[PDB]
Design a protein around this ligand. Structure first.
Ligand SMILES: N[C@@H](CC(=O)O)C(=O)O
Ligand SMILES: [K+]
Ligand SMILES: [K+]
Ligand SMILES: [K+]
Ligand SMILES: [K+]
Lengths: 131, 157, 157, 131
């Protein structure tokens, strides 16, 4: 699974996710990646793309949830991300990347690691595997 | 008030992955983020940036998408993708793709050039041709690295 | 602190609909609700009641599901459904069904008898046969009214 | 589209949605009905099933929203449904039915009518189309 979330200079969020799905998956199996609210979501406030165990990301509505906890619990992005990994996963292994409309950027996961990279216009730039 | 961008290549890393493979991965991630960073400095809308960055992630065989996709129990490739544009919450998604070279672009097309949010399998293949996107044989998507990992997976039961 | 149940036959109703067709729809909703009401009285779990009530709604040709489903641009039927169990958030979903008599029960079976949450088109047809569900030719699901509705919809375009 | 939502005596919620989809849809089109979080959702506190304009329910993540505004805004089941309906639809026409873990029941829509029926062991029962 690959993905990319962006907030531009106009404050506009967008997200994109693409995958081959789970190795050895049954013919016609559909994971979280093409499901809006599960593997991918973007609204006024944020842009989110997920990766990991599809079945666990679907039942967790992970991507939408990042936006949900910011709208209703008014959390910050990095918290919303981490709140979501903690309480929506229940033994399922996943991760995600997100931006907010304020130019913030977060990753979060509960796997051993996640191939990710992030940047902001003020000049932040990280590329990571573990952490 | 500034742009930001992230890019990923899948959670769940080989807990022992060589530094060699790690460097390739980081290099790919860097190259992709760079396309994104440059697009954003030139004021490309976010929805265009996510698409162009994921095409690069789909084309390069390293990660599990496009060429380099994981294999089904049948040892072929079925690909899926989705895309969303925050401001009007506009959606496009595709599943069950077997010939489409860049699934994310087909998803963009679902969103912009179809009355629907989500088209899958044969109907999505047909839409690919209606829209004249690059299509190839399913073999194009299969890497020897992946064929090996399936063999290993099917035995693992 | 006791049981509750709702059933629906879809939103968006024709204001040009005859009084008799409206009573028939009400009859159907009552019968279905009743299966549910009696099931909850015999203490069957909520997850079993949603399935059995939807099975009846799929089998009766009135509403847009199972037999009596809406038609594709091609004049055939492609059905889809999903079910979910609240307590541990368990899920099953199916799409692209062409021969499966009760889509909702296949969804139930994705939940309970497959490692996956969502299986669609051909692969879902193959799952139907592995699980030995009742399957039938596509023509079975096609009703006269839906054929007329399709012509009328194609012409509005 | 057809659907059923149920809470039993144990306080357990469940939901089911099934359809032939949208008349004259393109071959292979998938709507909101088989999408966990859009057309169907059930959790600890509720069970929801949506019907109407697929694309609206999908971008709206409708069924998950009823649960979210309950679990995050503390709203009771009836408030939740009215909230999601009036303040989360945006020009799109859809309805839903829902059940709470407390034994409550609720319908709700913004279009001309919704075929529906609900009962509550109180001997409360009703079946409608318009209203
Ligand atoms: N999200 C993908 C797997 C991954 O994220 O690597 C799936 O479950 O199909
Ligand atoms: K790739
Ligand atoms: K569209
Ligand atoms: K039916
Ligand atoms: K399952």
């Amino acid at each position: 699974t690959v993905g990319c979330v962006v907030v531009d200079r106009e404050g506009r969020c967008a997200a994109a996710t693409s995958t081959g799905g789970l190795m050895n998956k049954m013919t016609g199996r559909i994971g979280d990646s093409p499901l809006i609210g599960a593997g991918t979501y973007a609204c006024d406030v944020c842009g989110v793309s997920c990766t990991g165990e599809g079945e666990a990301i679907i039942r967790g509505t992970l991507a939408r949830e990042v936006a949900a906890v910011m709208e209703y619990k008014g959390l910050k992005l990095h918290q919303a991300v981490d709140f979501v990994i903690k309480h929506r996963l229940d033994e399922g292994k996943a991760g995600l990347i997100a931006v907010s409309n304020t130019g913030e950027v977060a990753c979060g996961f509960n796997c051993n690691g996640m191939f990710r990279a992030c940047a902001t216009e003020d000049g932040f730039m990280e590329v990571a595997i573990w952490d | 008030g500034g742009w930001a961008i992230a890019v990923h290549g899948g959670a769940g890393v080989d807990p022992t992955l060589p530094l060699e493979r790690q460097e390739e991965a980081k290099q790919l991630l860097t190259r992709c983020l760079n396309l994104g960073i440059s697009a954003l400095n030139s004021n490309v809308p976010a929805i265009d940036v996510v698409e162009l960055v994921v095409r690069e992630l789909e084309t390069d065989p390293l990660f599990n998408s496009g060429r380099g996709s994981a294999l089904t129990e049948k040892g072929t490739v079925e690909m899926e993708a989705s895309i969303m544009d925050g401001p009007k919450r506009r959606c496009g998604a595709v599943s069950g793709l077997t010939t489409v070279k860049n699934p994310i672009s087909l998803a963009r097309l679902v969103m912009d050039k179809s009355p629907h949010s989500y088209i899958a399998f044969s109907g999505a293949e047909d839409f690919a041709r209606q829209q004249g996107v690059e299509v190839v044989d399913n073999e194009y998507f299969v890497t020897p690295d992946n064929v090996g990992m399936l063999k290993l997976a099917k035995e693992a039961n």
